[PDB]
Structure formats: structure tokens, C-alpha cells
Amino acid sequence: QVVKPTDERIIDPSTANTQLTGGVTYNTTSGGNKPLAGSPYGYETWIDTGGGVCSLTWYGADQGGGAAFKATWTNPHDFLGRLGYFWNENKPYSHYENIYCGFNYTRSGRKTAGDYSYIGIYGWSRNPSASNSNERLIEYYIVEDWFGNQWQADTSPMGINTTGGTVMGSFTVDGSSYQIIKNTRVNQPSIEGDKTFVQYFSIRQSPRKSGTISITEHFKKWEKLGMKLGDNMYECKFLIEAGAGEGFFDARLIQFYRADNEGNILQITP
């Protein structure tokens, strides 16, 4: 049994609509996780040197929940801009207890991020005891929203037509149904070079731009379906990914917090 925290330091995402200014801008690939001044969080930018101009601007430790950022892209080649927890310390997800993220952002409209795009929670995990070598490395997504494309509205959820792979099930958390997808990426770019690895997706069936994500509930549901993450969690960050196009993502709130099963805060910003 898990109690949802009621701490006053938690910012209500529903009313967190103030535009932020005065952030620190990063214009190039960060070369992995990089630290942030006065923050427990790390950012990463993947800005392919063969693609167009992209940026990520972190709004700082002292506003917008501490993890808020803006991102821009002009004809990217799979731009990823992300910010949040960096772990990578040989611990399973359970070690970090109950993980939450409150968010609120604006973004550019439909078809401004290419044929595929993702907004939500993202990371990797390593499973040294996986029964299949394809599943020794896992890339994971909790997809709250996307930019749609020429075929599908951004107001409707993406499916296997976008992600590839196989539907594994569904569950209801944080006010919406989520479709669970597993996909095998064959000889594709990863955190272990070009290789074969597995992807886990939770796709929110009601796309949204503000709310709270009970991240650990997704990890638990995947585990119940036999989608194991292993004992070495890499990161847990808020992501915007754009396949192509020209657009922006502009967060007014990104606040990570962790709590025990009785709702007591273990970590919160600011």
C-alpha cells in the first residue's frame, strides 16, 4: 500500500501556468549527463551535429519546481532534451521508492516535431541477469503527450504505428488509461553504442500538458507483465524528443519528488 504525499512543498500542477524567464542555455550535445548549479538534477542534450540548431534552457533551482526547462529545435535529427534524476549506481528502481513528477508546460502545435515525438518521463536501465541479451539494456518512456504528425492528431494517443513493437497490456493510473508497449530496437543508437536493446512504453490514452506522474506505478506494472528493468537504473528524467520539424517545448513546472510508502518526503526541490 502506498500513501500519496500531501506535503506543502509540492506545487499544484493545475495552476502552475506562469511563464519562466532567465534560464541557462545549452546549445550543443552535452556528452551524457551534466550537473546543474545548486541542483540535484542533471541535464542531457543530444543534438546530432548532422542535424539543425537545437537548444535546452534550464530555468534553474529556484523556480518552476527546480527541473523546468525550455527546448527548441530546427530540423533536428532525433533531438533529445532531458532533465531530472541521474542515478547509474547499480540500484534497482525499488531502491528509489515512490517517484513522482509534477509538470506543466506549453509547446508548439501539431506536426512541429516530425513523424515521431515524445513528451514525458524517460530513462534507461541495465539488467545484468536478463534471460535474453536483447533485454540486458532497456530504454523506457512514460508518454504523456506528443506533437502528432500528418496522419494522427496530437490530441489522440500514439500507438505501435509510431513506436513499433507489441502491445503488452494496459492499466489506469494518474487519471488515465495507459497502453503498455514493448519494442525491440535492432542495431540502433543507445547508451552502449549501436546495438540491439529493448524499449518499454506507457502511452497515456488521454494526452495532457499538466499533472502528476506516479512513475513507480509504471515500473511496478511493467514488472507484473514480465518487463523487467534489472538492478541498475540509469536515470529518470523529463524528456522532449523530436524526430524532425521546427518547434518548442516550454515548461512552467517540472518538479520531481520521492516519498516512502507512508507518504513521507525523501527528496524534493526546491
Side-chain angles (χ1 to χ4, degrees):
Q1 301 288 333
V2 176
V3 181
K4 265 72 174 173
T6 48
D7 200 289
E8 69 172 352
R9 292 169 291 175
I10 302 163
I11 301 155
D12 188 344
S14 70
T15 60
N17 58 17
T18 298
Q19 176 65 50
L20 303 177
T21 55
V24 53
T25 304
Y26 304 101
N27 305 109
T28 61
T29 292
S30 56
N33 175 253
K34 290 295 167 77
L36 297 162
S39 179
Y41 306 125
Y43 87 98
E44 177 163 356
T45 43
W46 174 251
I47 302 164
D48 194 307
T49 49
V53 174
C54 303
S55 74
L56 182 147
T57 301
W58 176 53
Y59 283 122
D62 296 296
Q63 58 174 0
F69 67 91
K70 179 183 177 183
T72 65
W73 53 95
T74 299
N75 308 309
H77 287 171
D78 196 14
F79 169 68
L80 286 86
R82 65 192 197 264
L83 205 147
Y85 293 132
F86 192 75
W87 294 325
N88 199 19
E89 55 180 352
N90 304 106
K91 301 287 178 173
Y93 80 81
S94 62
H95 171 83
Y96 303 97
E97 301 178 66
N98 308 107
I99 313 152
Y100 305 94
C101 183
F103 70 101
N104 184 309
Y105 61 86
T106 63
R107 58 160 171 87
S108 52
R110 185 181 170 182
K111 207 177 69 181
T112 58
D115 293 342
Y116 66 93
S117 55
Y118 304 97
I119 303 171
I121 297 300
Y122 173 91
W124 295 76
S125 193
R126 290 180 167 98
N127 186 5
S129 65
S131 61
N132 185 334
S133 67
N134 291 352
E135 294 167 21
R136 280 172 63 90
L137 183 66
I138 309 97
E139 182 180 39
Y140 76 83
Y141 291 82
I142 303 164
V143 184
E144 295 298 282
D145 193 19
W146 70 317
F147 295 80
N149 52 39
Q150 71 171 84
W151 307 281
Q152 245 199 121
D154 57 316
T155 49
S156 57
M158 76 175 65
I160 57 165
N161 290 346
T162 300
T163 61
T166 311
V167 173
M168 302 293 285
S170 64
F171 81 128
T172 302
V173 74
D174 300 311
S176 178
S177 184
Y178 281 78
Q179 194 181 63
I180 312 300
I181 294 163
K182 182 183 175 187
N183 182 58
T184 304
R185 296 275 285 162
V186 177
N187 194 20
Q188 298 287 351
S190 79
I191 63 159
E192 289 180 1
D194 287 8
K195 65 159 64 180
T196 301
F197 61 96
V198 69
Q199 297 178 307
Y200 303 165
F201 293 91
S202 288
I203 312 294
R204 194 175 173 93
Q205 300 301 100
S206 181
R208 61 173 181 175
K209 298 189 189 73
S210 66
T212 302
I213 310 163
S214 302
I215 296 156
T216 302
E217 297 300 327
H218 291 272
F219 298 156
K220 285 172 173 177
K221 173 67 183 180
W222 300 340
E223 189 179 356
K224 289 284 196 296
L225 294 169
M227 296 160 65
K228 301 174 177 184
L229 289 159
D231 68 355
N232 189 10
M233 293 284 291
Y234 184 70
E235 72 187 320
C236 185
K237 299 192 177 179
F238 203 96
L239 166 83
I240 189 283
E241 182 172 4
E246 182 165 32
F248 74 90
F249 167 88
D250 198 342
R252 303 178 291 201
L253 173 75
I254 304 176
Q255 181 187 43
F256 285 94
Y257 54 100
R258 304 186 297 105
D260 62 26
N261 290 340
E262 295 184 351
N264 300 313
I265 293 292
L266 302 161
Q267 187 177 16
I268 193 158
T269 53

